[PDB]
Design an enzyme around this catalytic site. Structure first.
Site, short mmCIF file in Angstrom:
data_model
loop_
_atom_site.label_atom_id
_atom_site.label_comp_id
_atom_site.label_asym_id
_atom_site.label_seq_id
_atom_site.Cartn_x
_atom_site.Cartn_y
_atom_site.Cartn_z
N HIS A 1 -31.53 -18.39 -9.98
CA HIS A 1 -32.78 -18.57 -10.67
C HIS A 1 -33.53 -19.55 -9.75
CE1 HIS A 1 -30.28 -17.56 -14.22
NE2 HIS A 1 -31.44 -17.10 -14.65
N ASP B 1 -32.44 -23.17 -10.21
CA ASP B 1 -31.08 -23.58 -9.82
C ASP B 1 -31.18 -24.10 -8.39
OD1 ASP B 1 -29.75 -22.25 -12.13
OD2 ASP B 1 -29.64 -20.47 -10.95
#
Ligand SMILES: O=C[C@H](O)[C@@H](O)[C@H](O)[C@H](O)CO
Ligand SMILES: O=C[C@H](O)[C@@H](O)[C@H](O)[C@H](O)CO
Ligand SMILES: O=C[C@H](O)[C@@H](O)[C@H](O)[C@H](O)CO
Ligand SMILES: O=C[C@H](O)[C@@H](O)[C@H](O)[C@H](O)CO
Ligand SMILES: [Mg+2]
Ligand SMILES: [Mg+2]
Ligand SMILES: [Mg+2]
Ligand SMILES: [Mg+2]
Ligand SMILES: [O-]
Ligand SMILES: [O-]
Ligand SMILES: [O-]
Ligand SMILES: [O-]
Lengths: 386, 386, 386, 386
Positions: free
Chosen positions: D53, D56
Site C-alpha cells: 500500500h 506502508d
C-alpha cells in the site's frame, strides 16, 4: 492397509447406510435396506456393532406379532455375526403427531405418548444389551417467539428426563442416558442447542449421574463452534457418554457427510483428543451417503468413515510421539499450563511482590508463544510430510 | 415521549460512549472522553449508573498517587449526580502481556499477575458500591489446536475462579461474579463460548452460588443462536446475574450496535421475557457508537439504546395484555404446556391405556398449532398496527 | 386493517400454500391441495395471480390426455376468477433422475431430457400469459471437489440457456428468463450461489438482453449477505425481472418463513427500495406455511405475507415523506453523494490543488456523518413511534 | 523439505509480515519493520516479490523529500536482491477521513482526495514494474440502511474506476486493475461483497478489458461460499488477474491465517484448480502472523505459507496423475460433462424421441454417480495414504 476390525469399536445406525435419499426437495434415490442385510454387510466391513431408532427396526404402527417377528430376525443376524448393539434411541420426530415436539409438545397427551413410546423402546434396548440410550430432541423448539415459553418447556423437559430416570431406577436397569444437542433444523431453533446448554441442563436433573451428552461433529459446526473444544469440556466434566462422528462443511443445513470430509483439521484434533484422553466408548458414525450414490457408493462411503478415523489416529499418535514436537510444546509452555497458578493459596499470592508490584510486564509481553512453528509441525504430520 | 429516568435502571460502560473508533483497519476518529464528562452527560440523558474496566478509569501503569487522584475526581462526579456504579470488571485483554490470555495464559507468571490485577480492582469496586463483578475472558482461547490443551486450561480457569471466590469470602464482601461468554474474536475460538458452556462450567466451581452469567445479545448471535432462548435457560437456572444489551446483524465480527438495531424481533422477545420474568438487575448497554459519528452522534446513539428498550417494553406489555392474544395463546395450548405431563407418576402412566395403546395418533396429529396467527398478532403489536 | 388489492400485484406459487409439510426429518402434516381450490382461495384473499412448476400442475408421468385435463381444469378456474399467471418454472430437482442436476448433470442424456422438459413448459406458460420464466438450478452443484469441474459445468449451463434463448427467438415469444440464485441446499454448494454470480454469468450468454435475475430474500441471507444491497445492484444493472419475498432467521437451512418474519428491518429497507425505485413486476411470495399449521394456519400465513408488505410500505413512505428525515439526509450528505465526483474529467481533477495539495484532511476527518440520528428516525417510523 | 524458488512466484505484502499485531481489543505486540529488512528477509526465504500500500512504504503526511528518501531506500533493496514488485494498492481505509469510504464517501471532496491519492501511487507502481493495481474498497458501505443509497454509490464507484481507466489510457501505461471483494468488516456490509458481485460490476465499466478481480480465500469463506468454485467462475470469465492466499476457519471476523490453515481441503481443491488451469500470475499471500508470535514466529508463519502451497501442489498432481483416479473420473462421467448437450442445435434436440418421449428416466435415475469412491481417493492422496 488401515483396515477396521471390531476392536476399533466402530458402530453405525440402521438409518445411516439405510437412508434412501429422500430430502426436502427430492424423492428417494435408493430402495429400503433390510436391517439383516445391513448387519451382515457391516460385519463384513469390519464394524463392531449397530444402533437403531425403534421405528428403524419395527415399522410404525406394527402389531405385536409383526414386532416379535422383526425383533426375532434381527436378533438372529446379530447372533450369527457377533455384532453388538451398544446404543439405541427413539424416533420422536418423523410422525406428524410430533410436529410440535415430543417431551415439550404444547399438547399434554402427545407428551405422555412420547414418554410411553420411549419406555417401550428402553425395555427392548436393555434386552439387546445396549448400555446407552440417546435422546435427540429434534422437534423440541419453535420457529416463532410466543409459540413456546422456554422456561416452562425446560420444566417439561426436566419432568420427562426425571420420569425416565425413576423408571430405569425402579427396574434396576444398567443403562444411562445421553442427550444429543442440535442448534436448529427441522425447527427454527431447538432447545438445548449445543454441548454447553445440554451439560448445564443435566445439573438440574434429579439424578444427574444418570445423564451425559452424545455430541455430533456437524451439529456444533452448524453453530460455527469448535467441536474438539466442546468435546474437551464434556471430558473435563466426566460426561462424554457417547459420540457421533461425521463431517460438515460450514454453517448450513445438516449435511451428515462421512467422517474426515468437511473440516479435516478439526477431525485431526478430535481424534488426537479422543485417543490421548483414552475415551473408551463406541466410535459411532451418524452420516448419510449422498443421494447421488447407489448401494455400492453407500458401502464405499461407510468404509471411508472407518478408514479416515484409522489414518487420522496414526498421524496424531506420530505427532505426539515426535521429539521435535515435544520440544516445540515445551517451547510454547504447554508444560507450565499444567502447573497450578497458585497452589500456595491467596494469602501467599497477595504477599508476593513478583506477582504484581515487581512483575516485569514488558519482558513477559515480548516472549513469543512459538505457536505457528508448533502448528506447522502439526500440519506436516497430518499431511505426511513427516 | 419514551423518556428515561433512573428508575429504568439503564447503565452504560465508560468504554462504550468513550470508544474513540480505533478498529482493526483504522485509527481513532474521536478524542478521548473524560470519565467525569461521561458521568455528567449520562445523568443528563436519564441514565441510572455507569460501569468500568480498571484501565478505563485509571490508565495502565499509574502511580499510586495518580490513581488516588483519578478515583477521587470520579467519586466526586458520582456524588454530585446521584449516579450509581452497579458493576465493574478488569481489562485482561488490551496489554500485550495478555496476548495468550489471563487466567489461562500458558505462562504461569502472567496467570498470577492476571489474578493480582483482578483482586486490586475488586477492592475498588466494592468501595464504589458495585454488587456484580464481571469476567469476559476475551483472550482465553487459541487460533490453533496444540497451542492450548483445553482440559488443562479449564483446570486453570476453575483454579482462578475458586481463588477469587475464597478471596471475597475471607473479606466478607457482598459481591458476586458474572461470566460473560463470547464464541470468538479476538482469538480464533474462545473458551466457554456461549451461555450454555458458561452455565455448565459454574457447576464445577467450589462455591457455585457465587457465580452466574452476564450474556450479551450480539455474542450469542455471532454463533447464530437464539438470544431470548439462552436468557430463558439462564433465568430457569437462577443464574441471570446481569445482562448486556446491544445489536448485531448476523454472524460476523462483533458489531456492538445500539440496542434495537440488528435483529429487531429478537430485541422484542428479549424485552418481553425480561419484563414478564421480573428481572430486577441493570439494563446495561455494551455498545460502540459507529466511528463515522462525532460526539453528538455518540450521545444520540446512547439515547437511542434507552428509547428502543422503552418502546419495545410498551409494545410487549400491550401484546400480553390483549384479550385476542390471550385467546390465541389458549388456542395454541400454551396453557397445557404449564400442566405437568405426569404428576401421578410413572406407574399410573404405564397403566394408562389412553396414553399409548388407545391413543388416537392421527386425530392428535391433525390438530393445527395455530402458531402463525399468534405470530402475526405479535408482529401487529410490535409494528403498532394494534 | 391493510387490505390487498389488484394493483399491489401480490402473487403466490401453487407450491407455497400447497406445501404438505414433509421435510428431511418428517412426513406430511397436511393433505394435498387441488390447484383450483388454491386459485379460488387466493382470489378471495386479494391475490392477483398464481405461478407454478410444471409438476405442481400436471403430475409427473401424466399421459398427454391426463395432462390436457389438468390444464383445462386450471384455465377454467383462472377464467372464472380473473387471476393471472405472471410467471412459471420447471421442476428439475425432485425426480431422482435429477440427483446430479438438470442442465449441468454429468450424464449427457439427463441434460437433453432437462431441456425437453423445460421447452415443453415454456409453450404452456406462454399461452397462459406468463412473461417471465424462472430457472432455479437447485441440483446444479456438488458435495465434493472432483465430482464437478465447474468451468465445464458453466459451459453446459451457458449452452442450455443459449439453447433456450434460440428457441424463444425462433418462436417469436415475448418471454424473458430469470435466474434464481441459492448458495446451498439441496447440494453442498450450488452453482451461481448469489445475485452477483448470476448477474456476472448472464453477461456471457449470446443474447444477454433475454435474461435477468429472480432473487429470494432468504437465499441471499443464507450467505449472510445484505438483501436490500443486492437488489439495488440488480436494479442498477437493469436486471431485476422478478422477485421472491419471504423471511429467514439467519445462516441455516432455507426456512421460507412468511414475508416480514426473519429479518424485519431488512424487509423495511427492501420495501423502501422497491417502492422508491418504482419496481413494477409482481410481488411474489415463495414461502412455506410451517408444518405445525393446519389449512386455516396456511391461509393465515399467506394473508400475513401481504399485510406485512403493506404495513412496511406505509411506514417507508412516511419515513421518506417526513421533513425531519429529509433534513437528516442533507445533514448526512446523501445529496452530495448524487453529485459527480469529477464531471469535468481527470485533467481538471489533476490540476486542482484543493483536491490533494491544499486539502484539509483533518477538518474533513472531523465532520460527523450523523448516521445514528438518521437511523433512529427510521427506527421510530418502522415502529410507529412517529 | 519442499523449498520455494523463483518460478513458484510467491509474493507477500509489506503489511503481512509487517503486522504489528494491534487488533480491535488490544495493542501492538511487535515493533514496526523497516521495508528494506522485509525485502531482504523475504528474498532469503525464497520469495519472488513484494507488494505494498502507498502508506506502508511512505508514512502518511510525508513531504515530497521524505517521500523521495523512503522510495530510494526501497528501490536500492529491490535492486540489490533482484526482488520484483508485481502489484501495488492504495490505503483508502486507515485515515479517519476515509471513515465513510473513499470512492463512495458521501462527501464529494473526500472522493476527489481518494482519486488523487490513488493516481499518485499508480505512477509510482508503474515505474517499479507492477502490472496489476488492486482496489479493496474496505470502507465502502454502511452499518445502516439510509446512510448510503447503493444505486448512487454504484454510480460513484463506476465513475471513479472509469476515471482511473481514462488516466492509465492517456498515459499509455500497461497496468490492469483488480477489484478485491470482502462481504463485511470494517463496515457492517461492504459494496461488491463477493467475486460474483465484482465480476458483474466490471461488465458495466466503459473499458471492461482493463479490470478483473483479486479474490481472497478468507473473504469468500466469510460468506460461507466455496472459494475453488468462485475462482473457477472468474477463470471461466477471463478475469482472474491476481489472487490472495490465506486461511479462515469459518464465518466470523477476518482471520488471515497463513495459507493451508483453516479449510485445508478447500486449499487442496484451490491448488488443483490453479495448477490444472495454468494460472500464471503471482501466488500472493495476504495473511497476518498471529499476535501471539514474536518476529521468529512471523518468519516461521510466512515460510509455512509457501511450504503448504508446495505440498498441496505435489498431492494434487499425484491425484490427477493416478490411473485409478482417471478411471474413477470416467466412472463418474466427468468426460460426458465436456460433451455439448446438443451441438446440432435446438431443432435436432426437439426432433429426438430418445431425449423425452422414449427416454428411460428410471433406468437413468438408478445409475450411481460413484462420487464417494472418487472423493475418498482424493482424501487418500491429500493425506499421503496414496
Ligand atoms: O440431525 C439429526 C440427528 O443427528 C439424528 O440422526 C439423531 O442422531 C437420531 O435421532 C438419534 O440420536
Ligand atoms: O466483545 C467485547 C466484550 O463484550 C467487552 O466489551 C466486555 O464487555 C468487557 O470486557 C467487560 O465485560
Ligand atoms: O429452494 C427452493 C427454491 O427457491 C424453489 O422454491 C424455487 O422457487 C423454484 O424452483 C422456482 O425458482
Ligand atoms: O481485509 C483487508 C483487505 O484484504 C486488505 O488487506 C487488502 O489486501 C488491501 O487493502 C489490498 O487489496
Ligand atoms: Mg446430523
Ligand atoms: Mg460485543
Ligand atoms: Mg427458499
Ligand atoms: Mg483478509
Ligand atoms: O444427523
Ligand atoms: O462487546
Ligand atoms: O425457496
Ligand atoms: O485481508
Amino acid at each position: 492397509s488401515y483396515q477396521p476390525t471390531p476392536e476399533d469399536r466402530f458402530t453405525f445406525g440402521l438409518w445411516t447406510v439405510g437412508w434412501q435419499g429422500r430430502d426436502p426437495f427430492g424423492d428417494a434415490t435408493r430402495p429400503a435396506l433390510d436391517p439383516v442385510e445391513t448387519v451382515q454387510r457391516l460385519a463384513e466391513l469390519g464394524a463392531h456393532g449397530v444402533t437403531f431408532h425403534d421405528d428403524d427396526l419395527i415399522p410404525f404402527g406394527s402389531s405385536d406379532t409383526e414386532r416379535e417377528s422383526h425383533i426375532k430376525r434381527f436378533r438372529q443376524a446379530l447372533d450369527a455375526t457377533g455384532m453388538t448393539v451398544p446404543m439405541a434411541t427413539t424416533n420422536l420426530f418423523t410422525h406428524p403427531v410430533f410436529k410440535d415436539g415430543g417431551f415439550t409438545a404444547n399438547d399434554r397427551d402427545v407428551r405422555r405418548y412420547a414418554l410411553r413410546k420411549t419406555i417401550r423402546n428402553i425395555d427392548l434396548a436393555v434386552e439387546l444389551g445396549a448400555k446407552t440410550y440417546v435422546a435427540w430432541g429434534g422437534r423440541e423448539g419453535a420457529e416463532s417467539g410466543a409459540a413456546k415459553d422456554v422456561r416452562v418447556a425446560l420444566d417439561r423437559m426436566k419432568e420427562a428426563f426425571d420420569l425416565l430416570g425413576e423408571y430405569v431406577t425402579s427396574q434396576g436397569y444398567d443403562t444411562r442416558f445421553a442427550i444429543k444437542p442440535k442448534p436448529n433444523e427441522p425447527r427454527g431453533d431447538i432447545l438445548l442447542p449445543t454441548v454447553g446448554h445440554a451439560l448445564a441442563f443435566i445439573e438440574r436433573l434429579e439424578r444427574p449421574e444418570l445423564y451425559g451428552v452424545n455430541p455430533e461433529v456437524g451439529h456444533e459446526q452448524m453453530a460455527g463452534l469448535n467441536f474438539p473444544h466442546g468435546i474437551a469440556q464434556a471430558l473435563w466434566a466426566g460426561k462424554l457418554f457417547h459420540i457421533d462422528l461425521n463431517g460438515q462443511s460450514g454453517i448450513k443445513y445438516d449435511q451428515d457427510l462421512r467422517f474426515g470430509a468437511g473440516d479435516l483439521r478439526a477431525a485431526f484434533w478430535l481424534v488426537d483428543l479422543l485417543e490421548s484422553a483414552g475415551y473408551e466408548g463406541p466410535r459411532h458414525f451418524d452420516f448419510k451417503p449422498p443421494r447421488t450414490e447407489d448401494i455400492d457408493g453407500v458401502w464405499a462411503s461407510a468404509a471411508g468413515c472407518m478408514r479416515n478415523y484409522l489414518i487420522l489416529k496414526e498421524r496424531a499418535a506420530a505427532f505426539r510421539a515426535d521429539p521435535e514436537v515435544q520440544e516445540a510444546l515445551r517451547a510454547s509452555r504447554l508444560d507450565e499450563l499444567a502447573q497450578p497458578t497458585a497452589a500456595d493459596g491467596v494469602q501467599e499470592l497477595l504477599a508476593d511482590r513478583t506477582a504484581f508490584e515487581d512483575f516485569d510486564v514488558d519482558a513477559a509481553a515480548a516472549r513469543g508463544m512459538a505457536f505457528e512453528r508448533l502448528d506447522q509441525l502439526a500440519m506436516d504430520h497430518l499431511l505426511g510430510a513427516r
